[PDB]
Amino acid sequence: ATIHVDGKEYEVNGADNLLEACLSLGLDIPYFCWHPALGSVGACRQCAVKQYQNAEDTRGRLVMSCMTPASDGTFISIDDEEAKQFRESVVEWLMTNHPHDCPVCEEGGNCHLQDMTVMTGHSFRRYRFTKRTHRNQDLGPFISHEMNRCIACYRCVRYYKDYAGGTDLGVYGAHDNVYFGRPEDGTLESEFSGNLVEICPTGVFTDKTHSERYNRKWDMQFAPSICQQCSIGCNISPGERYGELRRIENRYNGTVNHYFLCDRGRFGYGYVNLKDRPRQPVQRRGDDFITLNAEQAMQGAADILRQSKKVIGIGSPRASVESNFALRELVGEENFYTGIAHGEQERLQLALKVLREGGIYTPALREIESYDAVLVLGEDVTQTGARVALAVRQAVKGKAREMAAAQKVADWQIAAILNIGQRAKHPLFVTNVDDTRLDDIAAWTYRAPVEDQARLGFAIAHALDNSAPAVDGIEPELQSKIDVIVQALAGAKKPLIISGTNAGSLEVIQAAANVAKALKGRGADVGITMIARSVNSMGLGIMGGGSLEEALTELETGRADAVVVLENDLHRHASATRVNAALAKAPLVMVVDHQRTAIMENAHLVLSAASFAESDGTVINNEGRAQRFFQVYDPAYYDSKTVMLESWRWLHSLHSTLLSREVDWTQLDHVIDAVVAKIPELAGIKDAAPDATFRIRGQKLAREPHRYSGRTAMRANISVHEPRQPQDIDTMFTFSMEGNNQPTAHRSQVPFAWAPGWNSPQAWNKFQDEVGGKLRFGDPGVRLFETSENGLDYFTSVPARFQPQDGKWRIAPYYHLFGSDELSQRAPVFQSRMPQPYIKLNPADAAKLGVNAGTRVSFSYDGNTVTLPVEIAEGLTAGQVGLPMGMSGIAPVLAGAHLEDLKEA
């Protein structure tokens, strides 16, 4: 299409509306109610331009550019005097009731309303009357509510309801008393409620966790990092100030997590700021804890390692690729053990084999929203991979999108799309041990044990393709529902099969692979998604090694006298008693970690590693994409006695001191090149980010904004002399403003979005080639593996039905978004949000034991009698007992595990 803006010709896409087309060209139109992800509704009337019928037209007409299609040969004007005066009048009308709140408002300096008030040039107030006020609600521990600052742009309700699928937020009231919130005080129920702080263009919804230790946006030090709280790998911008992590903002990745995080990623960063973290290396001498510097800790550790006869290394899926590789190099490939259980490692390896050998394309998180039918097998995605659940909701609304497109309704006119697609939606079939949070939009929900879910998947694969193995013992109504699933999936142009390793069953993953193969054989454009557990689970699976049980037997039999545990608490992957016995038997335990774990009581040496905020590295997400996270701040800048290094730096210097009796604090690119040379399956991680020599016209990339303040006074209480600026030899970023963050810079790693006149999160529009699309010059991250030409075979190992045996109790996993991730549990703000641990029981089983709802029962596993109060779960299958995974004492290795001595306390 061709448009003429202010007499200048432009070539745009005709399917877009005028506002997004003009913002993609760099033109500045003020706007409030439109969002690139939510569509156009034409409420705020801020985006007004003047449209003319032809070139020889002088009068024109004011139109909303967000609601005007960018048709071919469209003549408009933004800088028309009438349009400018109307946009100024809209800003003024918004400003009549706005509170005098900017100094004491957390959105100041990050406010879209401030930016558009300045952009319209409106700075004189001629309104002399009273301003309306509102009471505020309590929205829980995460979101702070300030209703006075609202401009009634309806972004919150549209996002939270039409996009996120939440139910408890809404718009109440009338003419100019419109209220946006919950009907009563209470916590926002959605797992994606945290994106309201970026969706809201004003200070109504604010980050309460940030509002505790508040600082303005110009005062933050930012870095482009990857969220470490599950395997999705959403791009984040951690921002720090005064040596502590202050905020997690969304970082735009048009291929992964474009505008939206989940609440675990956004608010579960509080473990970084804990005061019990290791900040110096500590050596045990009898009962004494001697604090060492880097050099003497490395010398003593390498000497004791040299006197040892066999050193084993226990990695972790929390650690980066470089740190796991450095441990593998230090202890040797044959002595390296992945720090996960044998069943967990088997499920992880099977998921990786399906992803990179099954011949079926695995979509990115953004690409999930374009699929026509979704089958989720055994994976509670809302609690384990939440952004996948959000993308599944978008893919479900794709049917309403297609129905509206059949009636020649444009894709940005969201109200008409929702009107045409009333309740018609794409087929969604979820299977779990109980009800999921996707049940409100699911076409069918199957509450069954993991064997029965696997048998359902194998039956679906057999009915789609008769070459697949059959299932014997299917009930006729279950067969009818299976047939419903089969005709829904076979009629889909782009079916999607989602599973993962959190189900605790190998057969569920095998059944999902069988369904995907059966759909691939029919010619469908099938995609497969596997949800892992931790941030670098796929990286640890690609690296390979032994299981944690093998390392425990190596420690117990005395074949290994030295163990180096990297970023692993060892209690989430094995029993605590056996781990404690093996670590007490081992004469040398060296724990390289950044969190105070329980295994440092018996550890001979504790190396104060860096977390993601204080380190660089690479992580492989659930779809096999290598992503580089960068260090946010130097921990030794404010506390000069802090020796907190990267884990790969610790292990590489330990290897160098073990070999040549000399420390070597290496560079990140050297470890990256070592990974690429030694492990060819991880050769793609070289291209995740450019090396430390990367420059933009000769200068580095800035971590902090141009107006970063207090540089001669933040450390003046320690010493009036300004310290040396921390040098960054590992990466292309600098710990200063002396760098580049231009939106037109040829790069893909963007620490934060800021353009002049756009201080809000809306500056990501300036950082994209087209708004709502990809990052300009490509999104960061590279897929490690391509789709194989030939797939796997059908898995003939069809499990039997779940048999409830007396005495035994099958543990059904119950994951929680706030409580299943270890570091997220360590965050103090999650302690109020996380629920009290309830053991879930069937009504029939609770009647059999005679226990009611709320009474405490005690059960023993691995000789550990623990007590929990009972919650009645009707959707659970009899013979199963539900356990909340990741919680206090309930390790996630209990999925699929049997249970003994379930008795009332």
Binding site: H100, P103, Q114, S123, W218, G698, R707, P756, G757
Partner: protein, 584 residues
């Protein structure tokens, strides 16, 4: 059409002459808010374009400015030739009362331009500074050596990839530079300094017991006569332009104060006028009158300092005490108005920081009654002394040709008989509404002639203050523009729109739309100009400051050659320079 409107200046006769001489495709005309025709010339045609402008019927006789620009990070270069770097040449035709900027584009690898020293002899120091701060080579330059940084300096500080902040201090570098200073006199080679050839060699500096700064002069002597002399400058280099690339538009005003520290608001004036050109701000008349008031008060302060310093350099010691009492009276008024003495930082984008305090007219009337009897006493006690006249008259004289070819402005140029004052030729800040004369010399610029012209300028500034006191407008002290930084304080404190504008203007900075502006003013020591490039951001993309003391110090060897050393001291005392103005 306001004065700040973006003009292309295609109706200038110089554009038609250039088109008729070199053809229509030989150059590109850029539309700016600088007020001058900006013409991008090809590099190979630069010397003939400069010669053609020098041979015009009313020629461009003065090279006003010559400096570089790093355009690698400039995003809004629409209609501009492709350039990793550029070099601009600002030329002034006094007879036409016009000026033209010529810009030469340069690639990143091919950073060399033909030298301009043959057409204009004052291009030498400008090309040395452009090489020093940008790495731009000038082919045919006699001694292309560093002029601000020491010779053992790596990198070019005004480039975009150069880190602006201070490096970590090291005693090793201080000890090495002390050893270099100690062995400098032992291993002095008069070939790297641009000199040639009983010829004594002496160093005047680097420390100097005077009030104009501390700088070093290498003197070649035949007995008492000065055969050759080059100045070693850059000892007072504060990196003010690089700070222009690091501050916001509003928070850079205190840095503009300290360019020449005897001027204050006189130094603030061209910067805020250029920023108001970038912002599209037409300030009201009371703002113009207040800014003229403060500029003339600081002009009287600076001229009293200059006359006292000259008299003390001659040898009389008492008038400096008396004129410092007069400076105390001026400082009392300035302290009452702005709150500070010599770096007020009171001018704002769109106006001034506060209104005039109630009672300022009493202090102005007291100073206006105090000044003239004291000035007459200074004249009759020192300026009419025949010993002072013998020490001053005939010392370092030059005509209009030497003043034009060296870029000499201010009292020296007008002492050569050229009636070129910025306040009359190219009026700014409502200077047309004041009745004042421009004193001129007979055609020869002595030390004594320059000093008496500064005395007459002081009297004319007293006349301006009298007219301003008798006719004071009532109105706003800030413009009503949305880009007036900061907004008026009471509206900020009780209106949310004004609070939002204030919040974003003081924190992130005011957003100047992408343009280029230029303001030239008649400062206390000559012509002071600000050339501002905005890339659409809250910071300046380029802040070029042309100061007159640089040009006067470059004119120093061409006027004192063949004279004595006491004549050199008197000439230094009568130039009206400060080393901060030289190095900035």
């Amino acid at each position: 059409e306001p004065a700040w409107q973006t003009r292309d200046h295609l109706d200038d006769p110089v554009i038609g002459e250039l088109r008729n001489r070199f053809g229509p495709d030989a150059f590109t005309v850029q539309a700016t808010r600088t007020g001058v025709p900006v013409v991008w010339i090809k590099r190979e045609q630069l010397l003939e374009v400069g010669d053609f402008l020098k041979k015009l019927p009313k020629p461009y006789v003065m090279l006003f400015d010559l400096h570089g620009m790093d355009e690698r990070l400039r995003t809004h270069r629409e209609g501009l030739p492709a350039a990793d770097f550029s070099v601009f040449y600002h030329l002034i035709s006094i007879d036409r009362n016009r000026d033209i900027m010529l810009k030469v584009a340069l690639a990143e690898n091919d950073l060399h331009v033909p030298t301009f020293t043959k057409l204009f002899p004052n291009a030498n120091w400008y090309e040395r500074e452009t090489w020093d701060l940008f790495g731009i080579t000038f082919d045919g330059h006699p001694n292309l050596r560093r002029i601000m940084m020491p010779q053992t300096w790596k990198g070019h500080p005004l480039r975009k990839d150069y880190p602006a902040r201070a490096t970590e201090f090291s005693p090793f570098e201080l000890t090495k530079a002390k050893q270099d200073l100690e062995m400098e006199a032992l291993t002095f080679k008069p070939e790297e300094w641009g000199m040639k050839r009983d010829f004594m060699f002496l160093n005047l500096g680097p420390n100097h017991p005077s009030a104009h700064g501390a700088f070093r002069i290498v003197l070649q002597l035949d007995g008492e006569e000065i055969v050759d002399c080059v100045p070693d400058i850059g000892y007072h280099h504060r990196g003010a332009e690089k700070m222009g690339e690091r501050q916001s538009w509003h928070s850079y005003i205190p840095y503009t104060d300290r360019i020449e520290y005897l001027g204050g608001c006189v130094n603030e004036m061209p910067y805020v006028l250029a920023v108001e050109k970038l912002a599209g701000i037409t300030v009201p008349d009371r703002v113009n009158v207040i800014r003229v008031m403060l500029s003339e008060l600081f002009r009287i302060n600076s001229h009293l300092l200059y006359i006292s310093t000259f008299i003390q350099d001659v040898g009389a010691m008492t008038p400096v005490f008396f004129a410092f009492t007069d400076r105390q009276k001026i400082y009392d008024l300035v302290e009452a108005i702005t709150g500070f003495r010599m770096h007020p930082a009171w001018f704002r984008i769109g106006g001034v920081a506060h209104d005039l305090p109630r009672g300022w007219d009493r202090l102005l009337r007291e100073f206006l009654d105090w000044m003239p009897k004291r000035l007459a006493s200074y004249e009759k006690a020192a300026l009419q002394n025949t010993i002072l006249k013998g020490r001053s008259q005939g010392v370092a004289a030059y005509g209009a040709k030497e003043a034009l070819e060296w870029g000499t402005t201010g009292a020296g140029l007008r002492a050569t008989g050229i009636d070129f004052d910025v306040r009359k030729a190219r009026p700014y800040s409502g200077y047309e509404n004041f009745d004042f004369e421009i004193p001129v010399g007979g055609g020869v610029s002595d030390c004594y002639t320059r000093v008496m012209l500064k005395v007459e300028e002081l009297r004319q500034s007293l006349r301006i203050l009298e007219q301003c006191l008798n006719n004071m407008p009532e109105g706003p002290f800030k413009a009503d523009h949305p880009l007036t930084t900061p907004p008026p304080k009471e509206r900020t404190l009780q209106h949310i729109e004004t609070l939002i504008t204030h919040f974003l203007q003081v924190s992130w900075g005011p957003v100047m739309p992408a343009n280029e502006s230029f303001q030239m003013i008649e400062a206390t020591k000559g012509i002071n100009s600000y050339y501002l490039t905005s890339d659409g951001s809250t910071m300046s993309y380029r802040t070029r400051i042309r100061t007159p003391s640089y040009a006067h110090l470059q004119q120093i060897p061409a006027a004192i050659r063949g004279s004595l050393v006491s004549d050199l001291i008197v000439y230094l005392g009568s130039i009206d320079f400060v080393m901060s103005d030289v190095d900035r």
